[PDB]
Structures are given as structure tokens and as C-alpha cells.
């Protein structure tokens, strides 16, 4: 089906049989999209294999992809038990996982949240004193991973651990135990997919079940929720909070360090709100503009999910172009949010870009680093706050510098996860 | 998934790991569902491999598969470039297929097509009438397969051929080249398809199509129909009104020749329908109300098609019953139409029941040899009018005795295509 695009007048790179355009992956994901945005511009049509996949760009169609005709035609991301997972699930299926969710991650029930995820804010603070006294630069993302790992265990279970000081707590060890080669050998061969997560793994989940069958489990539990049901969104939830907000916050802290500017003026929004390292709250962290920007801010340069992807359920015209059944659509979020097109000097660290004064010239169809429509990012306003209760306490004691071995400027990971080349390794300075 | 049925439920053979129930199949297709019916009853489950299927036997759970709740749960038969093919197409683009078909089937595009068929007829009696003359048994499938193919071609593309005086008109052998191992393979491991008819055969007709893109093929092109839907929709004609004509006359050959009675009875009726040996036409088949009995009741024994399946495409519940998604439920016409409880002596082969007295106490639901619903065969009027032009002529011409290798009583085959064990042969007299 190489030449379907070529057939509908949509330009795009040359596909080679079988293996498509994948071979211009080498870049990595995202500077492929950027290299495409630039030479075809606003649409172009690739091959992920055998598999079609049509880009857009403009926030009229993207719109019409993501919320106009989503239930209708662009319902489902691609597939390529975890089908009951609320992201893999489809049409009628994932309409019933979300609307039992929905209330799950309500304003309402993070605010109940606050008082547990702050603890874990403590506990960071410590392990990062611990390596703030020794003067010397600090891995993030162990305390950064260790922070996450422990919020995400007692969101999703009510497990109060310490990753960083308790090695092998039986719950933290096999949460440890998640994890490419097989992406790419599936973009081009998904058609082994009907052929093959630890069996273990599912089992001490599905188990640990029983201990709440007697945290989102409850909020799940208030067609029948199957327990495994239960168990492949907690699995959805473990990955989302964990490798996310780590990152994101790696690549937050990076930004502060090389821009001390904006870290003592975060610092000075903190200091003001919350004065005298006052323990945060939901209400304050709410108040925190710069610091809405600056996370808001990262995200654009950061977008860790990198593109937003429908599958083209059938023969559709949209906005005046025709997307055949079976296409995957996708909406290029990296590349949309470095272009030039929309955003001044796209490679700075401008925070002000969502400035209240700034905020409404941005479109919120070419800023989606959360996705939009009903099948956006359901855990946003728990990863926002997570993230932030994090950088409250932190530059309530600490601020960031740079070090010898701090790789400026920041490489990004040349694979399918959108991470730090390097480890993000700054020091540390109590205040 | 084995557990599905049990966690519903419902009884039936218990899969084993993998093969599901497929070992069941040593006895043939539609043994399984008789011995099926006979001990679980009224409805069973069973796993084709890993794939799980409901077999349903109650008239208002069938009507509610096949027609109610046709185009929203139950639209597409199981997938297991012919995804275009109208039997295998699905939802918005299955309803396109069908839509642009409809016509090409008309009453009334058939009344024209009778001239054409009628005159193979005449072809058929002269080969009968060469190995008559002979003085002994025919093996029917050869003159019966001659018939069906030359008719099957001259209405889809309207070449006149005679296959079995034509050794290899180019046409000809092509055309034979059509042909199980592969399907028990799949039915266990669909998982293979994913992986996976001669690029030549295509070929020659996306080819041949342009001696008419200059036939169905016109009433076809009579979104846009791809020349290439176009050979999918062939093809599948070529594979209906081959297979099917030649056995399903084959059985009512078989079943005039043991009944001698219905035979000579079906003559008369011939006789004064037409009289001495007039052309049959389209308006007079119609009249023959014995020779509609007769036919009616070859398909109740011998439904070529066996079962009728679609796939449950969400979670519902219908008369009564949970019908999770991704479930195949299955109608097995076979065991319904020889089940002591909607038939006597089942069987036996007896056209009255089909006598305007006794056709009212039938359920349409219960016999359904072309299906029911939206999406039943849709080349039913033309393979029935196909057939009765051929049995007319032939009976006009000849009467039809069992032989030394005449197999009785007939024996099915093992496989999963519905056709005599061995050939029928009968002797054919002049009369
Ligand atoms: C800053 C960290 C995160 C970012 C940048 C992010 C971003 C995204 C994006 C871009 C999407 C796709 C939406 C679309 O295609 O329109 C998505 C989907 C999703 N996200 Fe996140 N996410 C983050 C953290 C989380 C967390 C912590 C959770 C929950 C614990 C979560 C839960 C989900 C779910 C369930 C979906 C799928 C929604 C559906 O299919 O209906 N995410 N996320
Ligand atoms: C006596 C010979 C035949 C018999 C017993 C027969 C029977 C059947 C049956 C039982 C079905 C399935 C319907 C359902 O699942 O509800 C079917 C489908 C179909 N049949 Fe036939 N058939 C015969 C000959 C033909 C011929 C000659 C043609 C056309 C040239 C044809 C075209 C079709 C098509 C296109 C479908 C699929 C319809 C759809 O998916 O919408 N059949 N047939």
C-alpha cells in the first residue's frame, strides 16, 4: 500500500517496501517529524512499514481530529489482557473505562491527594540533603525516579515506601520490575503482533487487589469493573507517573539550572505564596503563575509523548481533504511546538510565552502537550500537581547549578522515549 | 480466554489449551454442531483455538443476530487486497459494497441474464447428451462444473466459452485456477495472519477489466468503485457460482435419481410448464411450484454454507443473554435444519414440506440456506433461477438412474467444504 499517498496527491519521504520510511527513524522520532514539517509543510503522508500514517498541522484539522469527529471516525489510537488498559481500549470499551475514571481524577478528588503526595516532597528534600551536604552534583532522575516512584505506589495502592532508603521493600522491587527493538522490528513487523509484561508481575498486582477488594483502586471500584480490568489501568497508571514526571522534571530542573534567572525568580513566587518554607497546599500551588509557566513552558520544548495519534475509522472527508479508513493520523506535538510558524525564537527557554499577557495568542490545537479532545491526557491535572508539589518543596531549600559533567547543551535521547541523552546531573546548594 | 464460556455460564466441550475445541472437528463441521445441539441444547460455546464462539439456536435470538441488531452489534462476519471483497468488507465501507450491488441483483437484471444462462443449458444437455449416447453413468461434477463455470464467466465478464468441449481457452484455464490445512491452521492460529490466490490470476482480471473499463462488471461500475473492488467482487462471484452450483445440483441430482417418484413428478411438471421441450424462461421457472420445492428442499439438507456467523462488535445483551465483544456468534443452518424439533424425519427427503399447505409453518429463522437479514446472500435469486434453468432443460431432456457406483446413501465430506464424499455418478438415459 505504498502508494496510497502518492495516489491521493499527499506528499512525503519515499517509502521502501516493507520497511516504509522507518529508516529515516536513525534521527530519532522527532527530528524526522521537524525535517518533514519543514520540506512538505503542513501535511504529509509516511509509512510506518506497511502501515500509512498522514501528519497534520493545521489547528483546523487537528481540531476536527482530536474533538469534532473523534467519536465518529478518529476514536481509537493505533493497537500495534492489557486491551482492557483505558488507553488501548476502544470505541464503546474505552468510552465505559473513561467514564468510570473521569470522576477518579477530578479537581475534586487531587485535592484529597495533596496531603499525601506532599509527604513524599519531604522525603526528596532529605535524600537530596543528604547529597547536598556531601557538596558535591546530584543524579536527578534516582531522586527524581525514587520521588516518583514512591507518589505513584501510594496514589495508586495507599503503600507508604521509601524507594530511595528502602531497597527491596517487596512492593518497591516489583514495581521496579517494568523494564525500542521491538517498536521498531512492530512498526515495521506488526504482523507478529498475533503471535506473543511478567506473568509475575500481573499475579502480585491482581493479588494485591484483594487487600483493597476487602487509593484509585477504591475511587475505580466507587458492565462490571473486572479486576483485571482494575489491574491494567493501575499498569497504565504505574508507567504514566513514573516515567513521565520524572522526565518532565528532569528537564524542568535542567532549564532552571542553566537559567538562574528564572529559578530565583520561581524561587521568589515560592518564597512570597508560601512563606518561610510553609508546606504547600492545593489552593497554593493554584496560585503559583510563574510557576504554572515555567512547567507549562518545559512542556512545550518537552512534550514526552511526542505526537498524538487516531486511527481513521473510516472514509472521511476533513476539511476538505480525504482520509481513507485504516490511515493513522497523527499531529506531530514536538515539531508543532518548535516551529517557527507559531512560536518566537522556538529553541529559547522563554517562560513568558504563557504570560497571562501571552497565554491567548497560543492556540490550543498546536500546544498539546497533554493532547486535546475528549481522549486527551486524563492523569494532566495530577501530573501538573504532582510535578509542582514537587518544585515547591525543592526550591523551598535548594537551588540548582550547573556542573563539569552537566551535558550543556542538553542531547536528547536518539531512541523512542523522549529523554535526557546524558543523565541530568546538576549541584546542589542548600539556600 | 478459555475460561469466557464458564464465566458466563454457558456450557460446551471443554477447549483444551490452544486447539480450543477444533479436535471436535475429526467428524466434520457439522457434526460438531449436531452432536452440539443434541447434548448442551439450545445454545453452547466453544473455542475455535483461542477464539471463542456462541452457537445460538433459538428463532428470536437469531432474528435479533441476523436482522435486529445487524448494522449495530452483529455487521461483520470474522476476518480470519480482497479486504475489499463484499463478503469481507466491513461496516460503513460493507454497507458502501452492498449498496452498489444491490441493483446488479435485481429481479429485474435477472430476467435479462436468462437468455444468456439458458443457452449453457443447451450446452450442458449436448455433453449429457454425448455421454448418454455412450450408454452409462456420468460423474456430475464434470458436466455440472463445466456448466457452472462457463455460465459463472459469460454473466461476470460475458465470454462465451464451453469448458468442457474447450481445453484451454486462456480464459478457461485461469479461471480453474482457483484451488483445509490452512484453515484448521488458522482457526487454531489465526495469529498467523498477519503474516501471509496467484498475483497472476489478479492480474489477468484487473487486466481483463479494461477490455470493460472501455457484464456485472457494467452493472457494477453502473467514493469511487476501485477497479480493483471491482476484481475483489468478481472473484467472489467466480468462487459463489462455481462451488456452489455444481454441488448444490449435484445433491438434487443425487436426490432425483433415489426418488424416482419426485423425479418423473418434477418432469411432469416440466412438461406442462413447457411443453415439448419448450425454452425455459424467466416468468415460467417462476411457475413451477414443485421444481421451488424441490430445490427449497436440497438446500435444507444440504446448506452449502453449513453455519452463518457474525461478531459481536460491543458488549450487549440480547433476548435475554450476555454477548461480550469480540465473540463469534454462530447459526448452525446444517444442525437446525435437521433437528427433530422444527422438522419430520428430518432425514428424509420429502418436498412437500415446502408446499404452499405446509411452507407457512416454517421459520424463516430456522431455515435460512441463503441466510436472513441485511446481510444474506445476495446472489440467492440468481443462483436459484442459475440452478432451476439447469435442472429444466436436463429433465426436458433426460431422466436419471442410480448406478453400480452410485455411493448410497451418500456420503459428506470430512472437510470443511460441503460437497459428496464421493463423486456422484449416475447413469442418464434419453427419454
Ligand atoms: C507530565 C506528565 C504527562 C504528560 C506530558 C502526559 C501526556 C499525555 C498525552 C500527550 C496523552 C495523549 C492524549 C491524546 O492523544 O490526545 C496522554 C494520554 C493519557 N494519559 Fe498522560 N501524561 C502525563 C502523565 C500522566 C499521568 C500521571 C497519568 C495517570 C496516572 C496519565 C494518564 C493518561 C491516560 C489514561 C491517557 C489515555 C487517555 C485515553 O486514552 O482516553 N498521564 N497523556
Ligand atoms: C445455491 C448457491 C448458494 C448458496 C446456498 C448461498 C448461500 C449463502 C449464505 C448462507 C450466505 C451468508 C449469509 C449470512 O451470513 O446471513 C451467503 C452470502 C453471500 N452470497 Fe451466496 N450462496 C449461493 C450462491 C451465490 C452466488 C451465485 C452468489 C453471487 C454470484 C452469491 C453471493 C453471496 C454474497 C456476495 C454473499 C455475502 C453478502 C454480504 O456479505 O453482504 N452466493 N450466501
Same mark, same amino acid.
Given at each position: ?7 491521493? %496527491?499527499? =506528499? ?15 534521527? %530519532? ?70 467514564? #468510570? ?138 508507567? !504514566? ?7 518532565? #522534571? ?21 518564597? !512570597? ?61 514536538? !515539531? ?37 479532545? =475528549? ?26 547549578? =550547573? ?11 536518539? %531512541? %523512542?522515549?523522549?529523554? =535526557? ?11
Amino acid at each position: 500500500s505504498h502508494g496510497l499517498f502518492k495516489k491521493l %496527491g499527499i =506528499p512525503g519521504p519515499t517509502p521502501l517496501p516493507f520497511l516504509g520510511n522507518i529508516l529515516s527513524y536513525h534521527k %530519532g522520532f522527532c527530528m524526522f517529524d521537524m525535517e518533514c514539517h519543514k520540506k512538505y509543510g503542513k501535511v504529509w503522508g509516511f509509512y510506518d512499514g506497511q502501515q500509512p500514517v498522514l501528519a497534520i498541522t493545521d489547528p483546523d484539522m487537528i481540531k476536527t481530529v482530536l474533538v469534532k469527529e473523534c467519536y465518529s471516525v478518529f476514536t481509537n489510537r493505533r493497537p500495534f489482557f492489557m486491551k482492557s488498559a483505558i488507553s488501548i481500549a476502544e470505541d464503546e470499551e474505552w468510552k465505559r473505562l473513561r467514564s #468510570l475514571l473521569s470522576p477518579t481524577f477530578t479537581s475534586g478528588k487531587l485535592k484529597e491527594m495533596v496531603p499525601i503526595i506532599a509527604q513524599y516532597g519531604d522525603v526528596l528534600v532529605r535524600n537530596l540533603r543528604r547529597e547536598a551536604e556531601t557538596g558535591k552534583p546530584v543524579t536527578l532522575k534516582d531522586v527524581f525516579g525514587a520521588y516518583s516512584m514512591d507518589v505513584i505506589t501510594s496514589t495508586s495502592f495507599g503503600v507508604n515506601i521509601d524507594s530511595l532508603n528502602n531497597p527491596q521493600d517487596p512492593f518497591v522491587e516489583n514495581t521496579k520490575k517494568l523494564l525500542d527493538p521491538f517498536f521498531l522490528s512492530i512498526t515495521v513487523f506488526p504482523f507478529l503482533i498475533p503471535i506473543l509484561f511478567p506473568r509475575e508481575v500481573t499475579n502480585f498486582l491482581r493479588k494485591s487487589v484483594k487487600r483493597m477488594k476487602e487509593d484509585f483502586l477504591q475511587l475505580m471500584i466507587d458492565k462490571a469493573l473486572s479486576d483485571l480490568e482494575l489491574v491494567a489501568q493501575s499498569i497504565i497508571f504505574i508507567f !504514566a507517573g513514573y516515567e513521565t514526571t520524572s522526565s518532565v #522534571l528532569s528537564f524542568i530542573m535542567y532549564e532552571l539550572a542553566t537559567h538562574p534567572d528564572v529559578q530565583q525568580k520561581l524561587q521568589e513566587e515560592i518564597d !512570597a505564596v508560601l512563606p518561610n518554607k510553609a508546606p504547600p497546599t492545593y489552593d497554593t500551588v493554584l496560585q503559583m503563575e510563574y510557576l504554572d509557566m515555567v512547567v507549562n513552558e518545559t512542556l512545550r520544548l518537552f512534550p514526552i509523548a511526542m505526537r498524538l495519534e487516531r486511527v481513521c475509522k473510516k472514509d472521511v472527508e476533513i476539511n476538505g481533504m480525504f482520509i481513507p479508513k485504516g490511515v493513522v493520523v497523527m499531529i506531530p506535538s514536538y !515539531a508543532l511546538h518548535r516551529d517557527p510558524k507559531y512560536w518566537t525564537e522556538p529553541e529559547k527557554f522563554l517562560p513568558e510565552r504563557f504570560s497571562k499577557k501571552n497565554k491567548d495568542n497560543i492556540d490550543p490545537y498546536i500546544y498539546t502537550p497533554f493532547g486535546s479532545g =475528549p481522549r486527551n491526557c486524563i492523569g494532566m491535572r495530577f501530573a501538573l500537581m504532582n510535578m509542582k508539589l514537587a518544585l515547591i518543596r525543592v526550591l523551598q531549600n535548594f537551588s540548582f547549578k =550547573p556542573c563539569k559533567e552537566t551535558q550543556i547543551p542538553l542531547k536528547l535521547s536518539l %531512541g %523512542g522515549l523522549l529523554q =535526557p541523552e546524558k543523565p541530568v546531573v546538576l549541584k546542589v546548594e542548600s539556600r
